[PDB]
Amino acid sequence: PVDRSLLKLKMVQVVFRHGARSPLKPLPLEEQVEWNPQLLEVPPQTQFDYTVTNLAGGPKPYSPYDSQYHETTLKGGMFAGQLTKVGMQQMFALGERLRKNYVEDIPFLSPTFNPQEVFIRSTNIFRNLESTRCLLAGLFQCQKEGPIIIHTDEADSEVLYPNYQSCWSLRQRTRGRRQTASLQPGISEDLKKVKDRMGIDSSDKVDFFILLDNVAAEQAHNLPSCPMLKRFARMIEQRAVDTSLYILPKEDRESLQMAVGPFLHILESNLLKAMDSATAPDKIRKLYLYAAHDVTFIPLLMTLGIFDHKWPPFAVDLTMELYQHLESKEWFVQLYYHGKEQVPRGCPDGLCPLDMFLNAMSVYTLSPEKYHALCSQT
């Protein structure tokens, strides 16, 4: 048994999903809920100025995703996929929770944003950059000692989600299952049933991802959803998860490696920086922030053996704390998901000795050189 009073907090990594937003695509029904631009009013307490650069960096890369979303105008006038004031407030509250843990309860982080203590990375999509702003606003109460810089990568090299367009081997392994996923036993019958009851045309192309997208977005904003959409909300969520897992199952190790392995390699590398005491204390940070996606969380959670079979909700976070025992000099990792203490695969306890944790992750970790080899057929 370890006495936690001799544990000293060294490093924190937070991976989070953006807050509540408008749907990527609306449902194909004559009667749709309105997405009103009034939902985009910025809460004053989240006002924080930042700039975005590439990883170098370097100018903010072009975002194909932002362009794609602006091609879709929802009933009411909002664009698809935009963070709302509801989402901004969720991200702010996550920020204030972090402040409680890492600023107030122990003096780990400065009360004001210090560029040298914090590394910030996001995918290059407006809802993630804005969520990052709101998280920081809550964590630092809109106070900074220096400019906030968010790093983002070119879409073609991005590792913060499974990248199908850039990784040829991943695309090839999953293509067959992706084709047939909605035709699988029990998924297909449920899908047919929900579409029938909702009066959605048999010809319309709709899967559980689209249904879940809309019910989660509508529910988070308390919009007047179709009564049948509400009746099936839980089943819809379950089947969206089943679809995802059929395509990228826990038993397919190599697909998991290519999907999340490079991101895990990043998280591992951060932990390892603690093993070198003298080397580059300049490069090391106290806090690493990554704005990632629900499609990142699912495989990520599975590789850590903590997946709960729920769709990762708006503003969810995965938090990794690294401690060193002051007497023993042993290193320990603690993992939390959505505020809840977790016990990862291959770990005896919630407080996991660093060496055992690293061994567990190493099953799925993918170095950049290996990953690069697989991204190409030739």
CATH of domain 1-378: 3.40.50.1240
Q: Which residues are catalytic?
A: 18, 294
Sign of the four-CA dihedral 73, 79, 81, 84: negative
Chain-centroid distance of CA 164 in Å reads 17
Q: Are 35 and 87 in contact (CB under 8 A)?
A: no
Resolution in A: 2.2
Cis before residue 350, ω within 30 degrees of 0?
no
How many residues are given for the chain? 378
Which tokens go with 306? 């903590």
Question: Please, which residues have CB within 8 angstroms of residue 161's CB and are 6 or more apart in sequence?
Answer: 123, 292, 293, 295, 296
Structure tokens at 110: 């400065």
Q: Of 189, 185, 201, which Cα lies nearest the Cα of 232?
A: 189
Closest CA to 35 of 73, 74, 68: 74
Method: X-ray
